[PDB]
Amino acid sequence: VDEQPLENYLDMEYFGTIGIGTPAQDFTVVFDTGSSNLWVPSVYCSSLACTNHNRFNPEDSSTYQSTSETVSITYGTGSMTGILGYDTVQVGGISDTNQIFGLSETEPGSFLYYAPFDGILGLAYPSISSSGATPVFDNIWNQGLVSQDLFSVYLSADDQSGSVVIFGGIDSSYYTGSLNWVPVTVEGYWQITVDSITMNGEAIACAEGCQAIVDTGTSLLTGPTSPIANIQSDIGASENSDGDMVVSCSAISSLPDIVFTINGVQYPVPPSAYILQSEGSCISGFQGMNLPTESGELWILGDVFIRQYFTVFDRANNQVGLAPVA
Protein backbone atom coordinates (compact mmCIF):
# COMPACT_ATOMS: atom_id res chain seq x y z
CA VAL A 1 0.00 0.00 0.00
CA ASP A 2 1.17 3.37 -1.30
CA GLU A 3 1.46 6.56 0.87
CA GLN A 4 2.37 10.16 -0.04
CA PRO A 5 3.46 12.27 3.02
CA LEU A 6 2.18 15.86 2.79
CA GLU A 7 3.72 18.95 4.36
CA ASN A 8 1.27 21.08 6.39
CA TYR A 9 1.86 24.81 5.77
CA LEU A 10 0.19 26.92 8.56
CA ASP A 11 -3.05 24.79 8.46
CA MET A 12 -3.86 26.53 5.11
CA GLU A 13 -2.14 24.43 2.40
CA TYR A 14 -1.11 20.77 2.10
CA PHE A 15 1.40 19.72 -0.52
CA GLY A 16 3.79 16.85 -1.29
CA THR A 17 6.74 16.17 -3.61
CA ILE A 18 6.28 14.41 -6.99
CA GLY A 19 8.88 13.39 -9.62
CA ILE A 20 8.24 14.10 -13.33
CA GLY A 21 10.47 12.71 -16.15
CA THR A 22 13.51 10.41 -16.63
CA PRO A 23 15.49 11.19 -14.55
CA ALA A 24 12.84 12.64 -12.14
CA GLN A 25 12.71 16.42 -11.73
CA ASP A 26 11.10 17.09 -8.29
CA PHE A 27 8.14 19.49 -7.71
CA THR A 28 5.84 20.24 -4.76
CA VAL A 29 2.12 20.00 -5.69
CA VAL A 30 -1.14 20.67 -3.72
CA PHE A 31 -3.11 17.39 -3.70
CA ASP A 32 -6.38 18.96 -4.64
CA THR A 33 -9.74 17.15 -4.53
CA GLY A 34 -11.38 20.30 -5.98
CA SER A 35 -9.69 20.09 -9.47
CA SER A 36 -8.70 17.35 -11.88
CA ASN A 37 -5.60 18.58 -13.78
CA LEU A 38 -1.97 18.08 -13.01
CA TRP A 39 0.35 20.91 -13.93
CA VAL A 40 3.78 22.26 -12.88
CA PRO A 41 5.82 25.39 -13.94
CA SER A 42 7.99 24.96 -17.08
CA VAL A 43 10.90 26.70 -18.92
CA TYR A 44 8.27 28.10 -21.34
CA CYS A 45 7.04 30.31 -18.47
CA SER A 46 8.37 33.78 -17.77
CA SER A 47 5.72 34.98 -15.28
CA LEU A 48 6.98 36.16 -11.87
CA ALA A 49 5.73 32.90 -10.13
CA CYS A 50 7.67 30.76 -12.67
CA THR A 51 10.98 32.56 -11.78
CA ASN A 52 10.94 31.48 -8.06
CA HIS A 53 9.48 27.93 -8.32
CA ASN A 54 10.93 24.76 -9.90
CA ARG A 55 10.46 24.64 -13.69
CA PHE A 56 10.03 21.43 -15.75
CA ASN A 57 12.66 21.28 -18.48
CA PRO A 58 11.32 18.86 -21.21
CA GLU A 59 14.80 18.76 -22.94
CA ASP A 60 16.23 16.94 -19.89
CA SER A 61 13.71 14.03 -19.85
CA SER A 62 14.20 10.89 -22.02
CA THR A 63 10.50 9.94 -21.65
CA TYR A 64 8.85 13.26 -22.60
CA GLN A 65 6.31 13.27 -25.42
CA SER A 66 4.96 16.64 -26.71
CA THR A 67 1.52 17.58 -27.91
CA SER A 68 0.23 20.59 -29.87
CA GLU A 69 -2.63 21.14 -27.30
CA THR A 70 -2.97 23.76 -24.59
CA VAL A 71 -4.66 23.94 -21.21
CA SER A 72 -6.12 26.94 -19.32
CA ILE A 73 -7.32 26.49 -15.66
CA THR A 74 -9.01 29.10 -13.42
CA TYR A 75 -9.09 28.44 -9.64
CA GLY A 76 -10.81 30.35 -6.82
CA THR A 77 -7.25 31.51 -6.06
CA GLY A 78 -4.82 31.59 -9.03
CA SER A 79 -4.88 30.62 -12.72
CA MET A 80 -2.58 29.25 -15.38
CA THR A 81 -2.19 28.60 -19.09
CA GLY A 82 0.09 25.88 -20.46
CA ILE A 83 0.84 23.24 -23.03
CA LEU A 84 -0.05 19.61 -22.49
CA GLY A 85 2.77 17.02 -22.54
CA TYR A 86 3.17 13.32 -21.58
CA ASP A 87 5.71 11.94 -19.10
CA THR A 88 6.20 9.51 -16.15
CA VAL A 89 4.99 10.95 -12.84
CA GLN A 90 6.26 9.37 -9.58
CA VAL A 91 3.51 9.82 -6.99
CA GLY A 92 3.13 7.94 -3.69
CA GLY A 93 5.59 5.16 -4.72
CA ILE A 94 3.63 4.63 -7.99
CA SER A 95 5.38 5.10 -11.37
CA ASP A 96 2.45 6.62 -13.33
CA THR A 97 3.64 6.19 -16.90
CA ASN A 98 2.26 8.09 -19.91
CA GLN A 99 0.66 10.83 -17.79
CA ILE A 100 -0.70 13.91 -19.53
CA PHE A 101 0.13 17.07 -17.57
CA GLY A 102 0.33 20.82 -18.17
CA LEU A 103 3.64 22.68 -18.47
CA SER A 104 2.87 26.31 -17.52
CA GLU A 105 3.24 29.15 -20.02
CA THR A 106 1.70 31.91 -17.86
CA GLU A 107 0.94 32.03 -14.14
CA PRO A 108 -0.45 35.60 -13.71
CA GLY A 109 -0.74 37.45 -10.37
CA SER A 110 0.79 37.60 -6.87
CA PHE A 111 -1.00 34.53 -5.35
CA LEU A 112 1.12 31.89 -7.15
CA TYR A 113 4.29 34.08 -6.54
CA TYR A 114 4.01 33.92 -2.70
CA ALA A 115 2.65 30.30 -2.53
CA PRO A 116 5.24 27.65 -1.33
CA PHE A 117 4.03 24.93 -3.77
CA ASP A 118 5.07 24.64 -7.51
CA GLY A 119 1.86 23.12 -9.02
CA ILE A 120 -1.44 21.32 -8.39
CA LEU A 121 -2.31 17.61 -8.66
CA GLY A 122 -6.08 17.40 -9.02
CA LEU A 123 -7.90 14.37 -7.58
CA ALA A 124 -11.50 15.02 -8.76
CA TYR A 125 -13.51 13.56 -11.70
CA PRO A 126 -12.52 13.69 -15.45
CA SER A 127 -15.66 15.68 -16.38
CA ILE A 128 -14.19 18.91 -14.88
CA SER A 129 -10.66 18.37 -16.33
CA SER A 130 -9.58 21.30 -18.53
CA SER A 131 -8.91 20.20 -22.12
CA GLY A 132 -10.31 16.76 -21.08
CA ALA A 133 -6.78 15.82 -19.81
CA THR A 134 -6.71 12.39 -17.98
CA PRO A 135 -6.38 13.07 -14.17
CA VAL A 136 -3.50 11.28 -12.31
CA PHE A 137 -5.69 8.88 -10.30
CA ASP A 138 -7.70 7.94 -13.43
CA ASN A 139 -4.45 7.13 -15.28
CA ILE A 140 -3.14 5.09 -12.24
CA TRP A 141 -6.39 3.03 -12.11
CA ASN A 142 -6.60 2.53 -15.95
CA GLN A 143 -3.02 1.13 -15.96
CA GLY A 144 -3.88 -1.33 -13.08
CA LEU A 145 -1.26 0.26 -10.79
CA VAL A 146 -3.55 -0.02 -7.70
CA SER A 147 -6.09 -2.71 -6.69
CA GLN A 148 -8.60 -0.53 -4.86
CA ASP A 149 -10.08 2.35 -6.91
CA LEU A 150 -9.93 4.74 -3.97
CA PHE A 151 -7.65 7.03 -2.08
CA SER A 152 -7.82 8.44 1.43
CA VAL A 153 -6.64 11.61 3.12
CA TYR A 154 -5.54 12.45 6.62
CA LEU A 155 -4.73 16.13 7.18
CA SER A 156 -2.83 17.01 10.38
CA ALA A 157 -3.61 19.95 12.70
CA ASP A 158 -1.40 22.62 14.38
CA ASP A 159 1.45 22.57 11.76
CA GLN A 160 2.29 18.94 12.65
CA SER A 161 3.88 16.21 10.45
CA GLY A 162 1.78 13.18 9.57
CA SER A 163 -0.63 14.33 6.82
CA VAL A 164 -0.90 11.59 4.13
CA VAL A 165 -2.73 10.71 0.96
CA ILE A 166 -3.07 6.92 0.73
CA PHE A 167 -3.48 5.68 -2.88
CA GLY A 168 -5.42 2.44 -3.26
CA GLY A 169 -6.09 1.84 0.45
CA ILE A 170 -7.41 2.82 3.84
CA ASP A 171 -5.49 2.85 7.09
CA SER A 172 -7.88 2.30 10.05
CA SER A 173 -5.12 3.59 12.40
CA TYR A 174 -6.23 7.16 11.43
CA TYR A 175 -9.92 7.07 12.50
CA THR A 176 -12.25 5.92 15.29
CA GLY A 177 -15.32 3.75 14.82
CA SER A 178 -16.53 2.77 11.33
CA LEU A 179 -16.64 4.76 8.09
CA ASN A 180 -19.96 6.32 7.16
CA TRP A 181 -20.47 6.34 3.38
CA VAL A 182 -22.11 9.29 1.51
CA PRO A 183 -23.21 8.98 -2.19
CA VAL A 184 -21.71 11.51 -4.64
CA THR A 185 -24.64 13.46 -6.12
CA VAL A 186 -22.88 14.94 -9.17
CA GLU A 187 -19.68 13.38 -10.58
CA GLY A 188 -17.32 16.38 -11.14
CA TYR A 189 -16.10 17.67 -7.82
CA TRP A 190 -16.51 15.24 -4.87
CA GLN A 191 -20.04 16.59 -4.40
CA ILE A 192 -22.45 15.47 -1.63
CA THR A 193 -25.73 16.70 -0.03
CA VAL A 194 -25.48 18.38 3.38
CA ASP A 195 -28.85 17.79 5.05
CA SER A 196 -28.53 20.83 7.32
CA ILE A 197 -26.17 23.08 9.27
CA THR A 198 -27.19 23.51 12.93
CA MET A 199 -26.12 25.26 16.18
CA ASN A 200 -27.94 24.55 19.53
CA GLY A 201 -30.61 22.50 17.66
CA GLU A 202 -31.50 25.42 15.27
CA ALA A 203 -30.68 25.46 11.48
CA ILE A 204 -28.37 28.45 10.87
CA ALA A 205 -28.04 27.66 7.11
CA CYS A 206 -29.11 24.98 4.59
CA ALA A 207 -32.34 24.16 6.55
CA GLU A 208 -33.68 21.96 3.72
CA GLY A 209 -30.39 20.66 2.38
CA CYS A 210 -27.64 22.10 0.19
CA GLN A 211 -24.83 20.84 -2.14
CA ALA A 212 -21.28 20.77 -0.83
CA ILE A 213 -17.92 19.62 -2.22
CA VAL A 214 -15.18 17.94 -0.16
CA ASP A 215 -12.04 19.89 -1.08
CA THR A 216 -8.58 19.31 0.32
CA GLY A 217 -7.42 22.33 -1.72
CA THR A 218 -9.69 24.88 0.05
CA SER A 219 -8.39 26.22 3.39
CA LEU A 220 -11.71 27.34 5.01
CA LEU A 221 -15.44 26.41 5.20
CA THR A 222 -16.95 28.19 2.21
CA GLY A 223 -20.57 28.89 1.27
CA PRO A 224 -22.87 31.45 -0.50
CA THR A 225 -22.36 35.05 0.78
CA SER A 226 -25.86 35.49 2.35
CA PRO A 227 -25.98 32.30 4.62
CA ILE A 228 -22.28 32.90 5.50
CA ALA A 229 -23.12 36.49 6.63
CA ASN A 230 -25.75 34.87 8.95
CA ILE A 231 -23.17 32.36 10.35
CA GLN A 232 -20.68 35.24 10.99
CA SER A 233 -23.33 37.10 13.10
CA ASP A 234 -24.10 33.86 15.02
CA ILE A 235 -20.43 33.22 16.03
CA GLY A 236 -19.84 36.93 16.92
CA ALA A 237 -17.51 37.85 14.04
CA SER A 238 -17.11 41.47 12.84
CA GLU A 239 -15.15 42.83 9.84
CA ASN A 240 -11.87 44.34 11.13
CA SER A 241 -9.89 47.34 9.76
CA ASP A 242 -8.08 45.12 7.19
CA GLY A 243 -11.15 43.18 5.81
CA ASP A 244 -10.53 40.14 8.11
CA MET A 245 -13.53 38.64 9.96
CA VAL A 246 -12.43 38.60 13.64
CA VAL A 247 -13.83 37.08 16.78
CA SER A 248 -12.51 37.40 20.34
CA CYS A 249 -10.03 34.63 21.23
CA SER A 250 -11.54 34.33 24.75
CA ALA A 251 -14.89 33.36 23.12
CA ILE A 252 -13.71 29.85 21.87
CA SER A 253 -14.47 28.69 25.50
CA SER A 254 -18.20 29.64 25.22
CA LEU A 255 -19.25 28.92 21.60
CA PRO A 256 -21.24 25.77 20.61
CA ASP A 257 -20.36 23.24 17.89
CA ILE A 258 -21.62 23.85 14.39
CA VAL A 259 -23.03 20.55 13.14
CA PHE A 260 -23.08 19.45 9.50
CA THR A 261 -25.67 16.68 9.16
CA ILE A 262 -24.67 14.49 6.23
CA ASN A 263 -26.79 11.42 5.22
CA GLY A 264 -28.61 11.60 8.58
CA VAL A 265 -25.28 11.52 10.52
CA GLN A 266 -24.08 14.41 12.67
CA TYR A 267 -20.57 15.84 11.99
CA PRO A 268 -19.80 18.50 14.67
CA VAL A 269 -17.08 21.05 14.05
CA PRO A 270 -15.88 22.50 17.44
CA PRO A 271 -15.06 26.28 17.94
CA SER A 272 -11.38 25.34 18.39
CA ALA A 273 -11.54 24.08 14.72
CA TYR A 274 -13.81 26.74 13.15
CA ILE A 275 -12.05 29.76 14.81
CA LEU A 276 -8.44 29.93 13.56
CA GLN A 277 -5.39 31.28 15.50
CA SER A 278 -3.68 33.68 13.02
CA GLU A 279 -0.97 36.36 13.41
CA GLY A 280 -1.86 36.96 17.12
CA SER A 281 -5.65 37.27 16.74
CA CYS A 282 -8.55 34.87 16.15
CA ILE A 283 -10.37 34.77 12.80
CA SER A 284 -13.51 33.05 11.44
CA GLY A 285 -12.92 29.82 9.50
CA PHE A 286 -16.01 30.70 7.40
CA GLN A 287 -15.57 32.51 4.09
CA GLY A 288 -18.16 33.95 1.73
CA MET A 289 -17.96 32.83 -1.91
CA ASN A 290 -20.56 32.15 -4.61
CA LEU A 291 -19.92 29.15 -6.94
CA PRO A 292 -23.22 28.65 -8.92
CA THR A 293 -23.73 25.33 -10.76
CA GLU A 294 -26.40 23.20 -12.49
CA SER A 295 -27.26 21.93 -8.95
CA GLY A 296 -27.44 25.28 -7.05
CA GLU A 297 -24.81 27.24 -5.11
CA LEU A 298 -22.05 25.15 -3.57
CA TRP A 299 -20.61 25.02 -0.08
CA ILE A 300 -17.00 23.87 0.30
CA LEU A 301 -16.01 21.49 3.08
CA GLY A 302 -12.41 22.73 3.11
CA ASP A 303 -9.45 21.87 5.34
CA VAL A 304 -11.25 23.04 8.54
CA PHE A 305 -13.69 20.11 8.09
CA ILE A 306 -11.21 17.47 6.72
CA ARG A 307 -8.86 17.91 9.70
CA GLN A 308 -11.73 16.72 11.92
CA TYR A 309 -12.75 13.85 9.61
CA PHE A 310 -10.61 11.22 7.88
CA THR A 311 -11.88 11.15 4.29
CA VAL A 312 -12.01 8.31 1.82
CA PHE A 313 -12.75 9.07 -1.85
CA ASP A 314 -14.10 5.94 -3.51
CA ARG A 315 -14.21 5.93 -7.32
CA ALA A 316 -15.45 2.27 -7.62
CA ASN A 317 -18.78 3.12 -5.90
CA ASN A 318 -18.85 6.96 -6.25
CA GLN A 319 -18.96 7.53 -2.48
CA VAL A 320 -17.08 9.55 0.12
CA GLY A 321 -16.28 7.88 3.47
CA LEU A 322 -16.02 9.94 6.67
CA ALA A 323 -14.92 9.05 10.17
CA PRO A 324 -13.64 11.13 13.15
CA VAL A 325 -9.83 11.38 13.28
CA ALA A 326 -8.17 9.34 16.06
Partner: peptide, 6 residues
Amino acid sequence: XVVXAX
Protein backbone atom coordinates in the same frame (compact mmCIF):
# COMPACT_ATOMS: atom_id res chain seq x y z
CA UNK B 1 -5.92 31.35 1.85
CA VAL B 2 -6.45 28.82 -0.90
CA VAL B 3 -9.61 28.00 -2.93
CA UNK B 4 -8.54 25.31 -5.49
CA ALA B 5 -11.31 24.79 -10.13
CA UNK B 6 -14.09 27.09 -11.49
